[PDB]
Amino acid sequence: MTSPFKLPDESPSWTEWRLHNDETNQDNPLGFKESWGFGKVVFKRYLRYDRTEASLHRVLGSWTGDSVNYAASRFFGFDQIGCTYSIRFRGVSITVSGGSRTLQHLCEMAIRSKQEMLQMAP
Amino acid sequence: MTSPFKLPDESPSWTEWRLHNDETNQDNPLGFKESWGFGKVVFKRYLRYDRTEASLHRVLGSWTGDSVNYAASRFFGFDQIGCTYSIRFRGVSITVSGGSRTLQHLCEMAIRSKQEMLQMAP
RNA sequence: GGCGGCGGCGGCGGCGGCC
RNA sequence: GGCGGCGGCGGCGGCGGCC
Numbered sequence: 466m467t468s469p470f471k472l473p474d475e476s477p478s479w480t481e482w483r484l485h486n487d488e489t490n491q492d493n494p495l496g497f498k499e500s501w502g503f504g505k506v507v508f509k510r511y512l513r514y515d516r517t518e519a520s521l522h523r524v525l526g527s528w529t530g531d532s533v534n535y536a537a538s539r540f541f542g543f544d545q546i547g548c549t550y551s552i553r554f555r556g557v558s559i560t561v562s563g564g565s566r567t568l569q570h571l572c573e574m575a576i577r578s579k580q581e582m583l584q585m586a587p
Numbered sequence: 588m589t590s591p592f593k594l595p596d597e598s599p600s601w602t603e604w605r606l607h608n609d610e611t612n613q614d615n616p617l618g619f620k621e622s623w624g625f626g627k628v629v630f631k632r633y634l635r636y637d638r639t640e641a642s643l644h645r646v647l648g649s650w651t652g653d654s655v656n657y658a659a660s661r662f663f664g665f666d667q668i669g670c671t672y673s674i675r676f677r678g679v680s681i682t683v684s685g686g687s688r689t690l691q692h693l694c695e696m697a698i699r700s701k702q703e704m705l706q707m708a709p
Numbered sequence: 710g711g712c713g714g715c716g717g718c719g720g721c722g723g724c725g726g727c728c
Numbered sequence: 729g730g731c732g733g734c735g736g737c738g739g740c741g742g743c744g745g746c747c
Contacts, residue, residue, distance in 0.1 A: 598729055598730070599729045599730095600729070600730090601729060601730070602729095603729075604729040604730090605729090607729090608729095616729095617729080620729095624740090626741080633729075666741090666742065666743095667741070667742080668741065668742085669739095669740045669741030669742085670740080670741085671739085671740065671741095682739070682740085684739065684740045684741085685740070685741085686740080686741060686742095687741090
């Protein structure tokens with residue numbers, strides 16, 4: 466299936482995750498998890514994120530309105546399907562959801578939600 | 588139970604809702620729905636909202652960090668419980684969730700989420 | 710980080726019902 | 729707007745298991 470994502474997955478191995486745990490804390494993870502769900506299908510990413518401008522800029526590029534619409538439209542037809550973006554970072558999860566007819570607005574809110582969460586006060 | 592909310596509920600009657608439907612469209616409802624959930628308990632509000640500054644200011648006052656913490660803390664103890672804010676307006680729902688230890692951060696994201704959604708481009 | 714399992718609570722979407 | 733019902737998909741939180 467074609468992904469809504471434009472960067473590949475970066476899930477740490479169990480060993481990398483242990484090492485990072487040994488050397489740091491839920492407020493300083495390796496990165497964050499995000500997902501786009503259209504109908505019955507879900508696409509997932511773990512992306513490394515270090516709370517700098519360069520890093521925020523990188524991870525904001527993991528999907529766009531267009532990449533999302535291209536992916537989701539594979540699943541469209543007459544009836545409306547449920548669409549969901551979810552992001553989790555530092556113990557907070559934000560999910561943005563609605564029906565496919567409102568996908569443009571869900572993307573707009575999803576991107577703002579992502580930026581606000583990834584810049585939230587330490 | 589003590590509510591996290593500081594404004595009373597404004598749910599339209601079935602007749603008011605029909606009349607409003609006859610005279611207007613999912614992009615122009617009477618208002619929006621919001622909820623705060625702590626453990627097993629959920630508190631809900633429908634609030635009238637007309638997309639003006641005065642109205643946005645009013646409905647942003649429906650809860651605060653303090654009102655939320657006072658309400659939620661009734662349900663606290665040793666073990667962490669799940670906390671959730673949900674808001675729905677114009678076909679988009681945003682839910683902010685995490686555990687009670689992170690309640691301050693959930694509130695910060697919940698208030699931003701509320702403002703962004705209620706000001707979203709028509 | 711990932712994958713099962715057992716409780717609990719939310720959310721979206723479809724279909725219909727009562728009001 | 730509210731309340732049932734029947735599919736589907738997600739989220740949080742608790743408890744434990746494998747890795």
